[PDB]
Amino acid sequence: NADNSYKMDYPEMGLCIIINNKNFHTDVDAANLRETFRNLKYEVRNKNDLTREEIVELMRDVSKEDHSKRSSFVCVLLSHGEEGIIFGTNGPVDLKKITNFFRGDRCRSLTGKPKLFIIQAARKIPVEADFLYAYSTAPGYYSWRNSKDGSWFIQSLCAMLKQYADKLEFMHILTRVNRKVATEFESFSQIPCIVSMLTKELYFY
Amino acid sequence: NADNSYKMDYPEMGLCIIINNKSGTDVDAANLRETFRNLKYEVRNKNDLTREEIVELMRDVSKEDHSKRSSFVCVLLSHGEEGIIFGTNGPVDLKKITNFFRGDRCRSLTGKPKLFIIQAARKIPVEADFLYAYSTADGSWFIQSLCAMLKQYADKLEFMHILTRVNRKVATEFESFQIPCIVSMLTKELYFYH
């Protein structure tokens, strides 16, 4: 039975990289994300208004670190754009380019460990083991620009994590977020999307 | 409480359309028939459909009455490159197929899980209550593992968990020597029992 769950009792839970290019034209998404993941014992680092190069450079430098004592890795991306799902301040960012830094062979320190990419975008996925993507294309129903504007996906994701991190498995949490966001948009009448290549269960306790 | 898992106690489990396009795929097909039949699905079997015929099939099915059915399953077995769904004469786009089963277009399947098992031997429609189990490659690893996992764990494990073990099993066989891709817009837990 222990074989079916990811080992999450390493000395550290892992890093949580939050990138906020939403404001680039205190943030309610970034603040809620930080507090949520800090309560999960993640080392949270916040970034703001990064160019495409700066993001790639950041993700590379992160992959060169020693995650030997870390349980997992989390990256949260907030940005706007037209083509693709992640964006720098200049333009679109190749997701294949980023995830390659963390492939099982490229980053031995994260091999067999879950790599979580949370993505909020506003107006090609890499299939590698132990990777998970939870992305949204619609942040809210009206405006998502300044630091006071909230992303429905992100805010509900934090809420579900606050309530169910010590009970539900991660996919079940994401499913409840799917339902939460779907119900929110339905009240005013675009659902999030879970892309999972995980090989085990993810429990945060 | 029960409101967080899909209602699966309708008179019928639902349709399970198995599409076999172009030996190893024959074993997979027979395996899928037995597996879904034991889960009390109504299994319909197609062979060597053109891309036009696949679209027509999904259109006809989406125009049926699914009021008494809990879910919908479609398994596609085909080969080729530059696509994930192949007719015997070209690639098919999911956007065409899945949009017949949109929650606002197929009202008898609204809020009910719509599963697509795609096996492609060698463009994501984001809609609520859809799930895509996608793989690229007797019988094949992905289908053999999927069926064996369903047979063993349908009474206990929820679909995502079952699929997760399939990923592990397939990835391990690669190690001993690519991994399936799960795309979920499900809003509830899927248990094949009730």
UniProtKB/Swiss-Prot annotation, chain B:
Gene Ontology CC terms, in alphabetical order: cytoplasm; cytosol; death-inducing signaling complex; glutamatergic synapse; neuronal cell body; nucleoplasm; nucleus; postsynaptic density
UniProt-listed CDD domains: CASc (cd00032)
Residues annotated as catalytic: H79, A121
Keywords annotated in UniProt: Acetylation, Apoptosis, Cytoplasm, Hydrolase, Phosphoprotein, Protease, S-nitrosylation, Thiol protease, Ubl conjugation, Zymogen
Activity regulation behaviour: Inhibited by isatin sulfonamides. Inhibited by BIRC6; following inhibition of BIRC6-caspase binding by DIABLO/SMAC, BIRC6 is subjected to caspase cleavage, leading to an increase in active caspases.
Description of post-translational modifications: Cleavage by granzyme B, caspase-6, caspase-8 and caspase-10 generates the two active subunits. Additional processing of the propeptides is likely due to the autocatalytic activity of the activated protease. Active heterodimers between the small subunit of caspase-7 protease and the large subunit of caspase-3 also occur and vice versa.
Name by which UniProt lists this protein: Caspase-3
Organism encoding this protein: Homo sapiens
